[PDB]
Design a protein around this ligand. Structure first.
Ligand SMILES: [Ca+2]
Length: 254
């Protein structure tokens, strides 16, 4: 097993860049998704240069900050995606932040954007004026169709979370999604179980329910998008930012 930190372990694809000295995040630089403007939205990915050996454990701690933006014009969310496919395929097919994407792939999403035609968004009651979002494990089948899998393991069994707020006390010690916060993703290869922790909540699934297998090696993609595939343009800042310097990724490469 290795442990790595830093953006140089990833190859960037699509609508992604580096933001130097963000005045609102408290870090000296940050990787920034959803920059620019296109008529069918924005889509971007960072692909880990090594593949992950799924016969061995992994633990990821990813520091992410969500856009402080309406969920009808802001970013679609974060998708932490495992696939035999690659980032260039993701850029034209989608990942796990919508209704369809890269086939036979799966991972965990932090959903920050309301796609009013999507069944998963409707059942999660994402429509509203607040910063309404939700977390979930998602699997794409052999035709690429996305389905929620696993479940939330808090008492609520609910997926809902506020992905940003209007607090003037962001350093009070509590969760404020527009600042940098830990996404923890843990996998125990012996048992097949994958767990995600974010915003004080916890989810769990098996890699079997994600459509993945133990005796394989997968590409790992940190992905985001903004209104991608919806033919609605880009009409607000939807920056989604991750501090890869302060993140850590432990896994067995393959
Ligand atoms: Ca959504």
């Amino acid at each position: 097993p290795i442990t790595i930190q830093g953006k140089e372990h990833f190859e960037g694809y699509g609508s992604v860049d580096i933001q130097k000295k963000p005045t609102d995040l408290g870090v000296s630089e940050v990787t920034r998704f959803n920059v620019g403007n296109e008529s069918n939205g924005l889509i971007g990915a960072l692909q880990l240069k090594n593949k992950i050996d799924f016969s061995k454990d992994f633990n990821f701690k990813v520091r992410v900050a969500n856009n402080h933006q309406s969920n009808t014009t802001g970013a679609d969310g974060w998708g932490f995606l495992f696939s035999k496919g690659n980032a260039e395929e993701y850029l034209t097919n989608g990942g796990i932040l919508g209704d369809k994407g890269l086939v036979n792939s799966g991972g965990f999403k932090i959903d920050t954007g309301y796609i009013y035609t999507s069944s998963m968004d409707k059942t999660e009651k994402q429509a509203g004026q607040g910063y309404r979002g939700y977390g979930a494990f998602v699997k794409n089948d052999s035709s690429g169709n996305s389905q929620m899998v696993g479940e939330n393991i808090d008492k609520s069994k609910t997926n809902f979370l506020n992905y940003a707020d209007n607090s003037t006390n962001t350093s009070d010690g509590k969760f404020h999604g527009q600042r940098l916060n830990d996404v923890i993703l843990t996998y125990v290869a012996s048992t097949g179980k994958m767990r995600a922790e974010y915003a004080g909540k916890t989810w769990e699934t098996s890699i079997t329910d994600l459509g993945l297998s133990k005796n394989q090696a997968y590409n790992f993609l940190i992905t985001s998008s903004q209104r991608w595939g919806l033919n609605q343009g880009i009409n607000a800042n939807g920056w989604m930012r991750t501090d890869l310097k302060g993140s850590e990724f432990t896994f067995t490469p393959e």
